[PDB]
């Protein structure tokens, strides 16, 4: 369907501040090409997209113990909407 594929919204000062200019950013499924992610992002907020760029992002951490870490392998996507901005109501966090 459409509602899948994505993950969680990018929570940071740059994401939020770049949202002010109609630029959105959220995490998606690494194994997801840059078309179905466009189709999907569109058919969920009722908006077309012009700009699109995504990249992959590892992770590997740990606290104490002796159990090293593990790659968390993510992928952040950044979409740019046309003239009509402020999507739904989550564009003013």
């Amino acid at each position: 369907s459409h509602y899948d594929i994505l993950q969680a919204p990018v929570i940071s000062e740059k994401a939020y501040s770049a949202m002010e200019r109609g630029v959105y950013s959220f995490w998606v499924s690494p194994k997801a090409t840059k078309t179905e992610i466009k189709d999907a992002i569109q058919q969920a907020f009722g908006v077309r997209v012009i700009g699109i760029s995504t990249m992959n992002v590892p992770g590997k951490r740990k606290r104490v113990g002796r159990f090293i870490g593990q790659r968390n392998d993510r992928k952040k996507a950044i979409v740019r909407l046309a003239e009509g901005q402020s999507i739904e109501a989550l564009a003013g966090q």
Binding site: Y3, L6, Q7, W27, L90
Partner: protein
């Protein structure tokens, strides 16, 4: 889940599916938003999706063999 879930047609199944997945996505945004105060809701929906699919797939053998 009992006979009050399979009573619906074939399309409505998919409907419930996508709807639940929608709400599930919402709660999911809240999760990373730091607002999710209903985990059992997540788990619940997770369960209901599996139920739907299971059932529907059960109607794949009963009536054709």
């Amino acid at each position: 889940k009992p006979s009050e879930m399979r009573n619906l047609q074939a399309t409505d199944f998919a409907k419930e599916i996508d709807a639940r997945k929608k709400e599930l996505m919402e709660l999911r945004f809240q999760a990373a938003a730091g607002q999710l105060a209903q985990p059992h809701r997540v788990r619940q929906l997770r369960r209901e999706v599996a139920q739907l699919n299971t059932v529907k797939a059960e109607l794949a053998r009963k009536g054709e063999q």
